[PDB]
């Protein structure tokens, strides 16, 4: 994924998934393992909110 | 040490020293009734006082820059 950004001609290198059959880097858009956008967006948002809430809690001593 | 009120004497002597510049306006420890320190025949070497100030400043500066002491703290019985 470094080449995805450093190299402007390597635009179509952004979906190197994980082929769990062999555990080798692999094109995944062709492979077809897909995740809904809403799922990842809400997952990241909820993880960040949970992190903020926990980090905002320190009013004990132990 | 004596017992007089410190801060009122402090302010009064400071105001008088503002009125007239004099290293002889200070505390009347012996209760002689006058703040004219020279009139009470008190003399000390200037070298002593300058050395006092310089030594105190140097020692305080040195202590300010030291933050390392090692202790075992085993609380032996």
């Amino acid at each position: 994924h470094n080449e995805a950004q450093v190299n402007p001609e390597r635009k179509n290198l952004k979906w190197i998934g994980l082929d769990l059959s062999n555990g080798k880097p692999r094109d995944n858009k062709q492979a077809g393992v897909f995740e809904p956008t809403i799922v990842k967006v809400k997952s990241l948002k909820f993880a960040t909110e949970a992190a903020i809430t926990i980090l905002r809690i320190d009013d004990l001593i132990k | 040490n004596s017992g007089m009120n410190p801060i009122q004497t402090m302010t009064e002597v400071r105001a008088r020293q503002v009125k007239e510049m004099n290293p002889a306006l200070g505390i009347d420890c012996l209760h002689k009734g006058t703040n004219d320190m020279k009139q009470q025949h008190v003399i000390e070497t200037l070298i002593g006082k300058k050395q006092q100030i310089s030594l105190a400043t140097q020692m305080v500066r040195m202590i300010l820059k030291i933050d390392d002491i090692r202790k075992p703290g085993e609380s032996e019985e």
């Binding site: - | 000390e44 006082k49 050395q51 006092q52 100030i53 202590i63």
Partner: protein, 77 residues
């Protein structure tokens, strides 16, 4: 002849010895002056001030005090 344990007390002891064999009188002055210097230095440290600038300001202040002492000098036979 104090049971000094921390090296800072020993440093104050050598301060007193240096003032004593340098002059002889005023050895109490350096100790009390350092005590008060540290008195306000510890609140300045509590405010969150690193010792370097405190030491520099203290040295400037010592120079000012020495200049005042030189200004208000008076000598006799």
């Amino acid at each position: 002849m104090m049971d000094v344990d921390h090296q800072i007390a020993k440093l104050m002891v050598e301060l007193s010895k240096s003032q004593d064999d340098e002059i002889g009188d005023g050895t109490t002055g350096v100790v009390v002056l350092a005590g008060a210097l540290l008195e306000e230095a510890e609140q300045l440290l509590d405010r969150g001030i690193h010792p370097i600038r405190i030491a520099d300001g203290y040295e400037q202040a010592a120079r000012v005090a020495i200049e005042h002492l030189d200004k208000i000098s008076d000598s006799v036979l």
